[PDB]
Amino acid sequence: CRNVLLDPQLVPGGGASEMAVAHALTEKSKAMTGVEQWPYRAVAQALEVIPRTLIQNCGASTIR
């Protein structure tokens, strides 16, 4: 209620949200180039470990 009352804008996430940012950063690292791209690509991946674990409970090859 404090969330909605502050910002009527909210994410339709569901672990979709961690994932959304993770892929977002990978796209940008490639475009920008520069000395920043390797540390920025490293953090992109860290975020992606988390929604992968949610699929681990469900079954099959998580990464596919």
Place this chain on the structure above:
Amino acid sequence: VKNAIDDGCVVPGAGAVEVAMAEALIKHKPSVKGRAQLGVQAFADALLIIPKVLAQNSGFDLQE
């Protein structure tokens, strides 16, 4: 290909044959006695290794 000349009949494989044969055993007693039945379960699940494990190598869960 020597065998193909020997037999007249060649089946589709890839652990196709083996699930079919295992299914046939689980359902009824082949001799109708309980003495036979204790080895029969054992015989049927032994066969299932060949198909499931092609899935395992590849990275696809075996039960599915």
